[PDB]
Write a protein that holds these residues in place. Structure first.
Motif, PDB file in Angstrom:
ATOM      1  N   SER A 162       0.834  -1.198   0.000  1.00  0.00           N
ATOM      2  CA  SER A 162       0.000   0.000   0.000  1.00  0.00           C
ATOM      3  C   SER A 162       0.871   1.251   0.000  1.00  0.00           C
ATOM      4  N   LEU A 163       0.749   2.043  -1.060  1.00  0.00           N
ATOM      5  CA  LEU A 163       1.540   3.258  -1.212  1.00  0.00           C
ATOM      6  C   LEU A 163       0.918   4.417  -0.435  1.00  0.00           C
ATOM      7  N   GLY A 164      -0.409   4.434  -0.370  1.00  0.00           N
ATOM      8  CA  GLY A 164      -1.137   5.500   0.297  1.00  0.00           C
ATOM      9  C   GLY A 164      -2.342   5.930  -0.517  1.00  0.00           C
ATOM     10  N   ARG A 165      -2.762   7.181  -0.355  1.00  0.00           N
ATOM     11  CA  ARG A 165      -3.895   7.706  -1.113  1.00  0.00           C
ATOM     12  C   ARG A 165      -3.476   8.831  -2.055  1.00  0.00           C
ATOM     13  N   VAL A 166      -4.212   8.987  -3.153  1.00  0.00           N
ATOM     14  CA  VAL A 166      -3.948  10.053  -4.118  1.00  0.00           C
ATOM     15  C   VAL A 166      -4.544  11.368  -3.631  1.00  0.00           C
ATOM     16  N   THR A 167      -3.689  12.369  -3.442  1.00  0.00           N
ATOM     17  CA  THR A 167      -4.119  13.656  -2.903  1.00  0.00           C
ATOM     18  C   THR A 167      -4.141  14.751  -3.964  1.00  0.00           C
ATOM     19  N   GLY A 168      -3.457  14.504  -5.075  1.00  0.00           N
ATOM     20  CA  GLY A 168      -3.416  15.460  -6.163  1.00  0.00           C
ATOM     21  C   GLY A 168      -3.167  14.807  -7.506  1.00  0.00           C
ATOM     22  N   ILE A 169      -3.806  15.338  -8.541  1.00  0.00           N
ATOM     23  CA  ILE A 169      -3.579  14.877  -9.904  1.00  0.00           C
ATOM     24  C   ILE A 169      -3.334  16.087 -10.795  1.00  0.00           C
ATOM     25  N   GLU A 170      -2.267  16.043 -11.589  1.00  0.00           N
ATOM     26  CA  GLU A 170      -1.946  17.166 -12.467  1.00  0.00           C
ATOM     27  C   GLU A 170      -1.342  16.736 -13.802  1.00  0.00           C
ATOM     28  N   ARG A 171      -1.724  17.432 -14.867  1.00  0.00           N
ATOM     29  CA  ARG A 171      -1.190  17.176 -16.202  1.00  0.00           C
ATOM     30  C   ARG A 171      -0.740  18.495 -16.819  1.00  0.00           C
ATOM     31  N   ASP A 172       0.560  18.617 -17.051  1.00  0.00           N
ATOM     32  CA  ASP A 172       1.137  19.849 -17.552  1.00  0.00           C
ATOM     33  C   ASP A 172       0.857  20.980 -16.581  1.00  0.00           C
ATOM     34  N   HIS A 173       0.851  20.634 -15.298  1.00  0.00           N
ATOM     35  CA  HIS A 173       0.695  21.600 -14.219  1.00  0.00           C
ATOM     36  C   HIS A 173      -0.761  21.932 -13.947  1.00  0.00           C
ATOM     37  N   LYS A 174      -1.655  21.373 -14.751  1.00  0.00           N
ATOM     38  CA  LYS A 174      -3.066  21.689 -14.633  1.00  0.00           C
ATOM     39  C   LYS A 174      -3.716  20.652 -13.748  1.00  0.00           C
ATOM     40  N   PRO A 175      -4.406  21.111 -12.717  1.00  0.00           N
ATOM     41  CA  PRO A 175      -4.999  20.196 -11.733  1.00  0.00           C
ATOM     42  C   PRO A 175      -6.227  19.469 -12.274  1.00  0.00           C
ATOM     43  N   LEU A 176      -6.295  18.162 -12.042  1.00  0.00           N
ATOM     44  CA  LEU A 176      -7.429  17.364 -12.493  1.00  0.00           C
ATOM     45  C   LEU A 176      -8.158  16.732 -11.312  1.00  0.00           C
ATOM     46  N   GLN A 177      -9.466  16.553 -11.460  1.00  0.00           N
ATOM     47  CA  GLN A 177     -10.263  15.870 -10.450  1.00  0.00           C
ATOM     48  C   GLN A 177     -10.093  14.368 -10.603  1.00  0.00           C
ATOM     49  N   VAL A 178     -10.282  13.888 -11.829  1.00  0.00           N
ATOM     50  CA  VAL A 178     -10.111  12.475 -12.146  1.00  0.00           C
ATOM     51  C   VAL A 178      -9.367  12.305 -13.471  1.00  0.00           C
ATOM     52  N   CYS A 179      -8.920  11.083 -13.747  1.00  0.00           N
ATOM     53  CA  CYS A 179      -8.309  10.758 -15.031  1.00  0.00           C
ATOM     54  C   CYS A 179      -8.887   9.457 -15.571  1.00  0.00           C
ATOM     55  N   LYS A 180      -9.585   9.551 -16.699  1.00  0.00           N
ATOM     56  CA  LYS A 180     -10.194   8.384 -17.331  1.00  0.00           C
ATOM     57  C   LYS A 180      -9.141   7.479 -17.959  1.00  0.00           C
ATOM     58  N   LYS A 181      -9.564   6.288 -18.372  1.00  0.00           N
ATOM     59  CA  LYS A 181      -8.673   5.353 -19.050  1.00  0.00           C
ATOM     60  C   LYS A 181      -8.356   5.858 -20.452  1.00  0.00           C
ATOM     61  N   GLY A 182      -7.174   5.515 -20.954  1.00  0.00           N
ATOM     62  CA  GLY A 182      -6.772   5.911 -22.292  1.00  0.00           C
ATOM     63  C   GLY A 182      -6.356   7.366 -22.403  1.00  0.00           C
ATOM     64  N   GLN A 183      -6.623   8.137 -21.354  1.00  0.00           N
ATOM     65  CA  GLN A 183      -6.255   9.545 -21.314  1.00  0.00           C
ATOM     66  C   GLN A 183      -4.736   9.671 -21.265  1.00  0.00           C
ATOM     67  N   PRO A 184      -4.193  10.775 -21.807  1.00  0.00           N
ATOM     68  CA  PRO A 184      -2.742  10.992 -21.790  1.00  0.00           C
ATOM     69  C   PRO A 184      -2.181  10.977 -20.372  1.00  0.00           C
ATOM     70  N   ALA A 185      -0.910  10.612 -20.241  1.00  0.00           N
ATOM     71  CA  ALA A 185      -0.277  10.423 -18.937  1.00  0.00           C
ATOM     72  C   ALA A 185      -0.359  11.646 -18.022  1.00  0.00           C
ATOM     73  N   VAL A 186      -0.593  11.397 -16.734  1.00  0.00           N
ATOM     74  CA  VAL A 186      -0.632  12.458 -15.730  1.00  0.00           C
ATOM     75  C   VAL A 186       0.321  12.161 -14.575  1.00  0.00           C
ATOM     76  N   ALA A 187       0.632  13.188 -13.793  1.00  0.00           N
ATOM     77  CA  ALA A 187       1.437  13.022 -12.590  1.00  0.00           C
ATOM     78  C   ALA A 187       0.544  13.073 -11.356  1.00  0.00           C
ATOM     79  N   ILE A 188       0.636  12.043 -10.520  1.00  0.00           N
ATOM     80  CA  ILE A 188      -0.196  11.950  -9.323  1.00  0.00           C
ATOM     81  C   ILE A 188       0.631  11.937  -8.040  1.00  0.00           C
ATOM     82  N   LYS A 189       0.090  12.552  -6.991  1.00  0.00           N
ATOM     83  CA  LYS A 189       0.758  12.610  -5.693  1.00  0.00           C
ATOM     84  C   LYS A 189       0.090  11.675  -4.690  1.00  0.00           C
ATOM     85  N   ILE A 190       0.855  10.699  -4.214  1.00  0.00           N
ATOM     86  CA  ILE A 190       0.377   9.721  -3.248  1.00  0.00           C
ATOM     87  C   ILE A 190       1.122   9.895  -1.929  1.00  0.00           C
ATOM     88  N   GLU A 191       0.374  10.040  -0.839  1.00  0.00           N
ATOM     89  CA  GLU A 191       0.976  10.216   0.478  1.00  0.00           C
ATOM     90  C   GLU A 191       0.134   9.547   1.558  1.00  0.00           C
TER      91      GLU A 191
END
Ligand SMILES: [Cl-]
Length: 247
Positions: A162-191
């Motif tokens: 268990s890594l933890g929970r996702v607290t933030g999602i961002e793509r090209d610095h733009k904050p996202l609520q969710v990320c669907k399948k097949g969508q371009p890669a995003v950076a997520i913060k798990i803590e």
């Protein structure tokens, strides 16, 4: 049976309101005519034990005694006042909605949406782990518990990390609520509170990441989220109880 308590100024208006509620499939436990008194509010309080949602009063064109109102306030019994019937209906529906949401919030941690992540890159190894991933299946939501499943070659025994929970999602610095399948890669913060797994030690970039579903999680999903959940998401869940060894 269980149901709400209604009160009307006259007998006819009472009959009409009751007919309306009959068509609205709203169950009524007890009735009353004239001003609302502490006794009637108590009579709704009886319903409070059996159903918290249904411990409410629908009052049409009726004065509410200060004593009764005060008792209702003290014991969390909602009293709804309206000049017209439809207004009363509306108030009740809104109430039920609010109750639903409040029931969701306690199960917020529990409800987990299935997703499979393939790490593209690593920005922070730990504390907190941040990972560039693309959702290959399902849907990544915030506050989603993430786990990596892997078997040590020597042990030959499955390890769930268990890594933890996702607290933030961002793509090209733009904050996202969710990320669907097949969508371009995003950076997520798990803590997570306390000590946390570390990349290049406990886990590697190659390791595929999965949502940490649990029997409880399933149960919650089917209890409050049945309408929302895609068929493909159910499929993925059934695929995931295997990798997580769920009963
Ligand atoms: Cl868990």
């Amino acid at each position: 049976g269980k149901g709400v308590s209604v009160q009307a100024s006259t007998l006819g208006s009472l009959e009409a309101l009751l007919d309306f509620l009959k068509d609205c499939k709203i169950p009524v436990a007890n009735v009353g005519i004239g001003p609302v008194y502490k006794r009637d509010v108590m009579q709704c309080g009886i319903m409070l034990e059996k159903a918290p949602d249904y411990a409410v009063m629908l009052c049409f064109d009726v004065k509410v005694d200060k004593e009764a109102q005060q008792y209702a306030d003290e014991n969390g019994i909602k009293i709804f006042t309206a000049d017209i019937i439809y207004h009363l209906f509306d108030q009740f529906t809104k109430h039920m909605q609010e109750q639903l949401e409040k029931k969701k919030e306690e199960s917020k941690m529990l409800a987990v949406f299935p997703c499979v992540l393939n790490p593209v890159a690593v920005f922070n190894k730990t504390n907190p782990i941040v990972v560039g991933v693309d959702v290959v299946d399902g849907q990544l939501k915030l506050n989603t518990p993430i786990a990596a499943v892997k078997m040590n070659p020597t042990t030959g025994q499955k390890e769930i990390i268990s890594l933890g929970r996702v607290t933030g999602i961002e793509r090209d610095h733009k904050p996202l609520q969710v990320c669907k399948k097949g969508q371009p890669a995003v950076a997520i913060k798990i803590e997570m509170g306390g000590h946390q797994p570390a990349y290049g030690r406990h886990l590697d970039e190659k390791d595929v990441l999965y949502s940490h579903i649990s029997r409880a999680s399933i149960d919650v999903l089917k209890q409050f989220y049945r309408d929302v959940v895609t068929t493909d998401e159910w499929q993925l869940i059934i695929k995931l109880k295997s990798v997580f060894d769920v009963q």
